């Protein structure tokens, strides 16, 4: 429904144009490679990758990072502001170490995803969009994540967890709290979206090179 996040920036002691931010030299090499990807005279096309790199280096996007990207790519700062406020993967506010996103679209909602949502609610003791006090987890409800067949599923810091049950999310959460990273992929041992007991496709070994090339080639 309603968003709840403001699209206007107000100066804050920890978020202001004087907030310290800069690029580490290897990030600068990555930036120059990204710029080299596009045709000359169209440098800006690199606003999204450079901004994403800044977010990955810092964890979130302060206004100072936005201005730094704008001055590096020589584009008006308002353009970077529009890019950052348009796309939803950019964090304009500090976010926890483990950013948990739970898909609640209709295909995922059909396979009992609200139960997993409330299980995370109970396990962490924080609301749908709040952050745990120790700055370790942040829960966010998102749209389709491209894993409809593996519903229900969650996405935590670029890793996909699929075919979850409530219990499974408690093991994921407490393993993350322990310190190690749980393995990405579907649960129940179904191995990336085949029928659980069907296996109705791709059983016979694939044919070799040039199995059916037509004449004249």
Partner 1 sequence: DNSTYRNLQHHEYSTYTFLDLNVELSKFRMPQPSSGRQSPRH
Partner 2 sequence: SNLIEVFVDGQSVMVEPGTTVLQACEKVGMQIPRFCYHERLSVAGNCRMCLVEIEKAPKVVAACAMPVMKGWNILTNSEKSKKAREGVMEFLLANHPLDCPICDQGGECDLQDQSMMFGSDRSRFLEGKRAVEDKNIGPLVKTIMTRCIQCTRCIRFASEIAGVDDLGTTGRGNDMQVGTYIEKMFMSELSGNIIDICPVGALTSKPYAFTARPWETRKTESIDVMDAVG
Partner 3 sequence: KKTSFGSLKDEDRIFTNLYGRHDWRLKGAQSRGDWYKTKEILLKGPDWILGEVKTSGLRGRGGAGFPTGLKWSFMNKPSDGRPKYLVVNADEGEPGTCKDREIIRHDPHKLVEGCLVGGRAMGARAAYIYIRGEFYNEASNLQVAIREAYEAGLIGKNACGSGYDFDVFVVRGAGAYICGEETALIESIEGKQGKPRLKPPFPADVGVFGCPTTVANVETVAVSPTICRRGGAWFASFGRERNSGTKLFNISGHVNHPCTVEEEMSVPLKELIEKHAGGVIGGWDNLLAVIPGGSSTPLIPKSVCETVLMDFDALVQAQTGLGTAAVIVMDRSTDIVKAIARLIEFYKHESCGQCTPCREGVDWMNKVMARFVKGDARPAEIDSLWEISKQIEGHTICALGDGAAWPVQGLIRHFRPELEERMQQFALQHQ
List all residues 6 or more positions away from 47 whose beta carbon is below 8 Å from its beta carbon.
69, 73, 75, 79, 80, 83
The answer to the question of residue 110 lying near ligand FES (CB under 6 A) is: no
**Both tokens assigned to 56:** 């990955």
**Number of residues lying near partner 2 (CB under 8 A):** 15
Q: Which is nearer to partner 2, 86 or 191 (CB)?
A: 86
The answer to the question of residue 111 lying near partner 2 (CB under 8 A) is: no
Q: Which of 5, 6, 22, 36 binds partner 1 (CB under 8 A)?
A: 36
Q: What are phi and psi of 122, to 5 degrees?
A: -70, -40
Which candidate, 183, 108, 118, 117, places its Cα nearest to that of 149?
A: 108
Cα–Cα distance between 8 and 12 in angstroms, integer? 12
Q: Which range of residues in 10-18, 54-62, 104-112, 117-125 is near ligand FES by CB under 6 A?
A: 104-112
The residue count of the chain comes to 217
Residues making contact with partner 3 (CB under 8 A): 1, 37, 39, 42, 44-49, 52, 75, 79, 82-83, 86-90, 104-107, 109-111, 142-151, 155, 158-160, 184, 191-198, 200-204, 206-214, 217
List all residues 6 or more positions away from 180 whose beta carbon is below 8 Å from its beta carbon.
none
Q: Which of 34, 80, 84, 108 binds ligand FES (CB under 6 A)?
A: 108
Q: Which of 5, 144, 181, 193 binds ligand FES (CB under 6 A)?
A: 144
Q: Which of 35, 53, 65, 103 binds ligand FES (CB under 6 A)?
A: 103
Which candidate, 22, 61, 55, 59, places its Cα nearest to that of 136?
A: 59
Applying CB under 8 A, the residues found at the interface with partner 2 are 3, 7-11, 63, 76, 78-79, 81-82, 85-86, 88
């Amino acid at each position: 429904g309603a968003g709840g996040a403001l699209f206007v920036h107000r100066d804050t002691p920890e978020n202001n144009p004087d907030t310290p931010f800069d690029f580490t030299p290897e990030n600068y090499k990555r930036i120059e490679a990204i710029v080299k990807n596009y045709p000359e005279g169209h440098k800006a096309a690199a606003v999204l990758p450079v901004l994403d790199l800044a977010q990955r280096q810092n964890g979130w996007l302060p206004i100072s990072a936005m201005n730094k990207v704008a001055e590096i790519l020589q584009v008006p700062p308002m353009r970077v502001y529009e890019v950052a406020t348009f796309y939803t993967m950019y964090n304009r506010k500090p976010v926890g170490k483990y950013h948990i996103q739970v898909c609640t679209t209709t295909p995922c909602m059909l396979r009992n995803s609200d139960s997993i949502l409330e299980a995370i609610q109970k396990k962490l003791g924080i609301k749908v969009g709040e952050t745990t006090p120790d700055k370790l987890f942040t829960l966010i409800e998102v749209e389709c994540l491209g894993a409809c067949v593996n519903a229900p599923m969650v996405q935590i810091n670029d890793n996909y967890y699929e075919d979850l049950t409530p219990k499974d999310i408690e093991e994921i959460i407490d393993e993350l709290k322990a310190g190690k990273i749980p393995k990405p992929g579907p649960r129940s041992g179904r191995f990336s979206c085949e029928p659980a007991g069907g296996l109705t496709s791709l059983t016979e070994p694939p044919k070799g090179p040039g199995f059916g090339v037509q004449a004249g080639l």
